[PDB]
């Protein structure tokens, strides 16, 4: 019955500041929010980029819920801790080149990419490891608590995480 909203999460690339970020969007066409120092949001963006003319990043507020539809907090009666494990990855240059409909099985068994002999990308690299490691993979990470904040950066590759690539 426990619930995590949205089902799918959307965050938007950014060239500011680290710190400098705005919070999703509430509703379908919405503008993006402004957020207070616990990091609420308040108004709607002012300005979409910093005064150096960086595009702030847009980030995506995640709510749990359970019992009967009520939202989960750290602030709750029967709560005593909620951690959060996000795992994020980019296979682009591991994956086949871009052929429009062409892998696409709604078409049937016949428009698979092998069927179609669509290529991979970065063709020159045969082997299963070699490919593995096409990808941009840095692990897990874990948050809790109130006010953390943990990057999905190179060096904080946990040593649980034994295949990482970048």
């Known amino acids: ?29 919405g503008l993006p929010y402004e957020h207070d120092v616990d990091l609420k949001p308040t108004t709607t963006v002012v300005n979409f980029k910093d005064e150096a003319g960086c595009i702030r990043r847009q980030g995506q507020v995640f709510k749990v819920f359970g019992a009967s539809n009520e939202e989960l907090t750290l602030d709750s009666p029967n709560v005593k801790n909620i951690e959060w494990t996000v795992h994020l990855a980019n296979k682009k240059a591991a994956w086949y080149e871009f052929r429009e409909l062409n892998g696409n099985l709604l078409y049937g068994r016949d428009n698979s990419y092998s069927a179609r002999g669509v290529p991979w990308r970065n063709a020159s690299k045969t082997a299963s490891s070699e490919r593995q490691s096409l990808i941009i993979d840095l692990g897990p990470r874990s948050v809790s608590g109130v006010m953390a904040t943990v990057e999905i950066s190179i060096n904080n590759i946990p040593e649980t995480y034994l295949h990482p690539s970048y």
């Open 1 to 29: 019955a426990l619930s995590v909203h949205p089902s799918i999460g959307v965050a938007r690339l950014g060239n500011a500041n680290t710190d400098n970020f705005v919070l999703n969007p509430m509703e379908i066409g």
